[PDB]
């Protein structure tokens, strides 16, 4: 009866694998509207319309830093747009505006008959992700747009840590040994500020600032968690509640916290 459920029942193995059940294709956005560039990843065989997620990099960075999420998420039934910002030196607020413009363009493309994603998106179900300043931008997006269904920033940074206005289910990936956005002054205070939402804090043991980026050695766990979080909250899919809410009880995790999760 959940009209948003897609794919086979999940297992730890299926979520830890490099690829999900659906086949993925991608394209470059010809005329980015409000951001620098973008790549759209989508499932070719999901079986119904799926939600959309927009992912932004950190300061100085480009799509390569976050690109692994595209196929990883899309293969589980999401349309994912990874973006380059107008400038590599844009700040979090600007990143947030750009992230939201990218979701808007995904909505446009869903209504464009020549697009490969024509009619593949449920525009009412969206999510936001991003690294560092792009993670802070994701949190700003969530605060300003509470109709967003899920947020999952990584190693976030904002000059302000008060995200008490965020009511969107938010999973914060953190990196233990982050020296750019130290956990104790960035990710953790951000997590602690959020009081009205389902939330989770997952710190990778021994991780540098780039611990959740393309090429990381914890793709099994990080990808399982990201996908589970998005499935649970973007699709209201309670088949993923244990995966989304559980403490992994893993040696790869140096700090785990969660609240209001079901």
Numbering used by the authors: 0 to 261
Task: Pull text from the paper.
In both crystal forms, the R103 side chain of one protein molecule penetrates into a surface cleft next to S131 (or A131) of another protein molecule. It appeared likely that the R103 side chain occupied the putative substrate-binding groove and prevented the substrate from entering. We therefore produced and crystallized the double mutant R103G/S131A (DM) for complex formations. A comparison of the wild type, S131A, and DM crystal structures suggests that these mutations did not significantly alter the overall protein fold (Cα root mean square deviation = 0.144–0.2 Å).
